[PDB]
Scaffold this active site. Structure first.
Site, PDB file in Angstrom:
ATOM      1  N   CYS A  46       0.814  -1.229   0.000  1.00 38.79           N
ATOM      2  CA  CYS A  46       0.000   0.000   0.000  1.00 38.79           C
ATOM      3  C   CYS A  46       0.842   1.271   0.000  1.00 38.79           C
ATOM      4  O   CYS A  46       1.952   1.293   0.542  1.00 38.79           O
ATOM      5  CB  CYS A  46      -0.972  -0.004   1.193  1.00 38.79           C
ATOM      6  SG  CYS A  46      -1.833   1.552   1.447  1.00 38.79           S
ATOM      7  N   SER A  48       0.672   3.747   1.740  1.00 36.84           N
ATOM      8  CA  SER A  48       1.057   4.092   3.109  1.00 36.84           C
ATOM      9  C   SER A  48       2.329   3.377   3.550  1.00 36.84           C
ATOM     10  O   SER A  48       3.113   3.907   4.354  1.00 36.84           O
ATOM     11  CB  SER A  48      -0.083   3.839   4.103  1.00 36.84           C
ATOM     12  OG  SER A  48      -1.225   4.657   3.841  1.00 36.84           O
ATOM     13  N   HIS A  51       5.089   5.503   2.428  1.00 39.78           N
ATOM     14  CA  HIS A  51       5.268   6.754   3.191  1.00 39.78           C
ATOM     15  C   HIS A  51       6.238   6.534   4.373  1.00 39.78           C
ATOM     16  O   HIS A  51       7.000   7.427   4.742  1.00 39.78           O
ATOM     17  CB  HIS A  51       3.929   7.330   3.662  1.00 39.78           C
ATOM     18  CG  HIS A  51       3.020   7.760   2.546  1.00 39.78           C
ATOM     19  ND1 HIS A  51       1.645   7.782   2.674  1.00 39.78           N
ATOM     20  CD2 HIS A  51       3.286   8.230   1.302  1.00 39.78           C
ATOM     21  CE1 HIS A  51       1.103   8.221   1.551  1.00 39.78           C
ATOM     22  NE2 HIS A  51       2.075   8.501   0.703  1.00 39.78           N
ATOM     23  N   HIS A  67       0.647  -3.514   6.253  1.00 39.68           N
ATOM     24  CA  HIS A  67      -0.581  -3.457   7.041  1.00 39.68           C
ATOM     25  C   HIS A  67      -1.816  -3.996   6.328  1.00 39.68           C
ATOM     26  O   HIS A  67      -2.891  -4.074   6.932  1.00 39.68           O
ATOM     27  CB  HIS A  67      -0.834  -2.029   7.499  1.00 39.68           C
ATOM     28  CG  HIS A  67      -0.994  -1.074   6.368  1.00 39.68           C
ATOM     29  ND1 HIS A  67       0.062  -0.700   5.560  1.00 39.68           N
ATOM     30  CD2 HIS A  67      -2.094  -0.465   5.864  1.00 39.68           C
ATOM     31  CE1 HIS A  67      -0.382   0.122   4.622  1.00 39.68           C
ATOM     32  NE2 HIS A  67      -1.688   0.280   4.783  1.00 39.68           N
ATOM     33  N   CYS A 174      -7.104  -3.183   3.712  1.00 42.18           N
ATOM     34  CA  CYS A 174      -6.900  -1.746   3.545  1.00 42.18           C
ATOM     35  C   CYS A 174      -7.494  -1.120   2.299  1.00 42.18           C
ATOM     36  O   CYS A 174      -8.464  -0.378   2.395  1.00 42.18           O
ATOM     37  CB  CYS A 174      -5.420  -1.327   3.656  1.00 42.18           C
ATOM     38  SG  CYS A 174      -5.280   0.485   3.695  1.00 42.18           S
TER      39      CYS A 174
HETATM   40 ZN    ZN Z   1      -3.074   1.156   3.477  1.00 45.78          ZN
END
Ligand code: ZN
Ligand code: NAD
Ligand code: NAD
Ligand code: ZN
Ligand code: ZN
Ligand code: ZN
Lengths: 374, 374
Positions: A46, A48, A51, A67, A174
């Site tokens: 993902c 994220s 990041h 995640h 997610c």
């Molecule tokens: Zn995510």
């Protein structure tokens, strides 16, 4: 034969910001009270997670990120009542403790036991179950799925349908749920409505899916990359517009196309400017705009509050607004009932060891979603 | 002996921006089809009328302003079915045509026949019923209540209880309904909740009354002027806070006071900074912030969308979100049924001819509300 004992396995450790993931032999401690050790079957890559690499989503390093995932329970610590060794599960990066202000609220889902607001990178008890060569490695969002085995707190895991294909349902951890819930849970899209989705990656596609399941009459896909249009229509978009084709601002084009504004708009991109554009293109008196992506390093946007005074509603959410432990199993069930398809979202599948390639794929924009398998 | 004929009377004409209102003899033409001529009994001085003076709110001049009022129907034009000569009425600056997309929407109230978005300063037919010495004078928001007589379109008037005290219920024409609806209609404040009201002028007091009617456990009044606190408590505030007393930002003290953020916040001031502060002091996961004042000349505010991503909801509305024609009669009925009081909001009462004094009182900040009488 592993229960109650340290397990040695491989994980993708991020030792430092802006560095490739390092596949390393790690030690995974057995579950303590109310914890659950899970053998990973698949995990999605993902934005994220990237990041973190970027130092943009600040969380303590070194860490095992990841995640969005699904796996099978290897063992449970004492006092655990919701899952059993052998069960298929999905880690919940947004926990559902069931006891805080938020979990008790009919409208809240951002459980106060979350490790997102002020990341600690540990288990709920302030410790870590991970070591690499004796050195402690942090957890991430209480999940840490970029490992062959992880240990999570019971409030951060949900039991799912024993027949589920984990290589597919992991997206429910997610990407899918975020997009899907933005439409069905946060916006509450209504039948016969007109929707505008800004950003046609994996999450935007899941928004379309939600708008379709909700019976929207029109779903206008918006994206500057026309290569995303085919798949968008394939999952439900009635039309697609590329802002680069037009000499006027897109909110104008959308307002005119929708004869005064759309009923529901969604921004999945996380861009300051498009979030404002998405807000303005919804009808002034009763339009609702929902954001689902906001980069942890976001600057402040600039907007005119008159957009709101007329009657518009602006809202955001994490994990599609779904109370995680309650919703995850229902979403899998829905998938198992053939209510929505996940395949359209999966463009690439790579063995876990090729994680860094998977990230190249993410950064380049070539994939909607890479799934890693163990 | 006035029906079907021109009425000569006095009105407060605003001849040019930034000038006192001029009391002139004006001629008020007979009502054409679906129009209603009303003899005014009382009208409130609202900040928005001052915005016309200031040129903040752009609408064609010269004009007869005034939009918060009550009066008695002098006569009706052909086709009118909702009011009769002799009825007590309240002009609706937000119309309810009942046929447009917004009027038909369960959540919308900003009827597309409004003269707010792009003011024309006329009747719905594009002409004016006012002249002064043969010169045409514009209408304002289809009400124009700063006149002994006005003519409004049927969709811009509602019939009210024949026993209503017009000197008081006129507040339902704007200030009261705006604040009261922000709480009971827009936010939908719930029982046992904690509310924060920024700005304790007439509109904020009305917000407080709605939070009280809705059964709020706590209603925290916020204002940098402590002289507003007594009245705020009198109408329902459980506590009042003055930002100037604190060495830290108000959203922090409010978050700490409400143990993690309030359930519902309201900005009635119209300030860019307090709008954002109001949003931030509501609970991150399920908090709702409602704005009710945005100066027509507002700049862009600056905010971080990370405030929305956690689960907050931001909305605004005109006229308390109330569908005007349906709601006004019910609000007067509630008043007549002793549900809430309006006296606390009325601080000054002046004969219509002293309109300029009333505006001095408004500009100085020394009145909550001045009501003018005929
Ligand atoms: Zn995510
Ligand atoms: O979330 P995710 O994980 O699915 O990420 P993602 O990167 O897959 O989604 C981003 C999408 O937004 C699009 N985009 C970027 N800027 C845009 C703009 N200004 N207007 C419209 N579309 C734009 C991109 O082309 C891409 O399709
Ligand atoms: O008509 P109306 O009732 O909307 O207008 P109003 O003038 O009656 O209400 C404005 C109120 O907001 C207060 N105020 C101004 N700046 C403030 C700030 N920064 N923080 C808190 N309160 C502030 C003023 O003291 C005043 O009571
Ligand atoms: Zn919780
Ligand atoms: Zn209408
Ligand atoms: Zn007003």
């Amino acid at each position: 034969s592993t229960a109650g004992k340290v397990i040695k396995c491989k994980a993708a450790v991020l030792w430092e910001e802006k560095k490739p993931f390092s596949i390393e032999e790690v030690e995974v401690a057995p579950p303590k009270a109310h914890e659950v050790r899970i053998k990973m079957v698949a995990t999605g890559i993902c934005r994220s997670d990237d990041h973190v690499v970027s130092g943009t989503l600040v969380t303590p390093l070194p860490v095992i990120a990841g995640h969005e995932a699904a796996g099978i329970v290897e063992s449970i610590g004492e006092g655990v009542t919701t899952v059993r060794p052998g069960d298929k599960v999905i880690p919940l990066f947004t926990p559902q403790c069931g006891k805080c202000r938020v979990c008790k609220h009919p409208e809240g889902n951002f459980c106060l036991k979350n490790d997102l607001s002020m990341p600690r990178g540990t288990m709920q008890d302030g410790t870590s179950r991970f070591t690499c060569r004796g050195k402690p490695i942090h957890h991430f969002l209480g999940t840490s799925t970029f490992s062959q085995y992880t240990v999570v707190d019971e409030i951060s895991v949900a039991k799912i349908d024993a027949a589920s294909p984990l290589e597919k349902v992991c997206l429910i951890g997610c990407g899918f749920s975020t997009g899907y819930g933005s439409a069905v849970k946060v916006a509450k899209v209504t039948q016969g409505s007109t929707c505008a989705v800004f950003g046609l990656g994996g999450v935007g596609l899941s928004v379309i899916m939600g708008c379709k399941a909700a019976g929207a009459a029109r779903i206008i896909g918006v994206d500057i990359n026309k290569d995303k249009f085919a798949k968008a229509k394939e999952v439900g978009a009635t039309e697609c517009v590329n802002p680069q084709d037009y000499k006027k601002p897109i909110q104008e084009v959308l307002t005119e196309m929708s004869n005064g504004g759309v009923d529901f708009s969604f921004e999945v991109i996380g861009r300051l400017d498009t979030m404002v554009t998405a807000l303005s293109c919804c009808q002034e008196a009763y339009g609702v705009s929902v954001i689902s992506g906001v980069p942890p390093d976001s600057q402040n946007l600039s907007m005119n509050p008159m957009l709101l005074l007329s009657g518009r509603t602006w809202k955001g959410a994490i994990f599609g607004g779904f109370k995680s432990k309650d919703s995850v199993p229902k979403l899998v069930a829905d998938f198992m009932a053939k209510k929505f398809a996940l395949d359209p979202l999966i463009t690439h599948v790579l063995p876990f060891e090729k994680i860094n390639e998977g990230f190249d794929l993410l950064r380049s924009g070539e994939s909607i979603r890479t799934i890693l398998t163990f």
